[PDB]
Each structure stands twice: as structure tokens, then as C-alpha cells.
Amino acid sequence: NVGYQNGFTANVTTNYSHTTDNSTAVQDSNGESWNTGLSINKGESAYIN
Amino acid sequence: NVGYQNGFTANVTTNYSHTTDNSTAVQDSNGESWNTGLSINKGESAYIN
């Protein structure tokens, strides 16, 4: 960066950084389910008397 | 960083830090489904009279 801060001024900055990281989690689940069902057979679909 | 401000300027910085965090999450779920179905037998496909 350069600029006019009471005359000329200028600066050169450099930087570098390093990270380590570690984490942990758990998870649950509990659920229900329903179902129905129908079926048919066309031909011999009914009886009589 | 080095640079110019009314002469020579220099600085050297070090920096370090530590972070910890914890979190929860709760998720509901609801849904429906439908299903149709067909079958046939090639060979003795249809009875006649």
C-alpha cells in the first residue's frame, strides 16, 4: 500500500499461517412405518351360489 | 513487513490462538408413498368359452 500520509509513504507486508483441526460427533435415529395393501385376480374374480 | 514512513520501517509479528465449539441439531421427517403393480403370464394368458 502507498499513500500520502504527510508526504510519500509506502509499505510491503507479507504473512503466512498454519492450522490444525479435529472434531467429533454422534447421531441417533428412531422412526416408525405403516403400510397397507390390496390385490386382485381378473378372471376367477368372484364366486356365486 | 518492511517499508517507508519518513525513513526505514520494519516490524515482525507472531500470532497464535485456540478455538473450541459445541453444537446440537434436531431433525423431524414426514412423508407418504404410493405404489401400483401389474403382472401377466405368457402362456395360459386367457380362458375362453
For A11, the closest of B1, B15, B47 (CB atoms) is B1
The resolution in Å comes to 4.5
C-alpha dihedral sign at B35, B36, B42, B46: positive
B13's CB contacts (< 8 A; 6+ apart) are none
B11's CB contacts (< 8 A; 6+ apart) are B1
CA–CA separation, B18 and A19 (whole Å) = 10
Determine the residue type at A36.
T
Which runs of consecutive H residues, i.e. helices, occur in B1-49? none
CA–CA separation, A21 and A24 (whole Å) = 11
Residue of A4, A6, A11 to mutate when probing chain B, most B C-beta within 10 A: A11
Determine the residue type at B28.
D
Buried b (16+ CB within 10 A) or exposed e, A24-42: eeeeeeeeeeeeeeeeeee
C-alpha cell at A30: 428412531
For B33, how many CA atoms within 13 A lie in the half-sphere containing its CB? 7
From chain B, pick out residues whose CB is under 8 angstroms from the CB of A31.
29
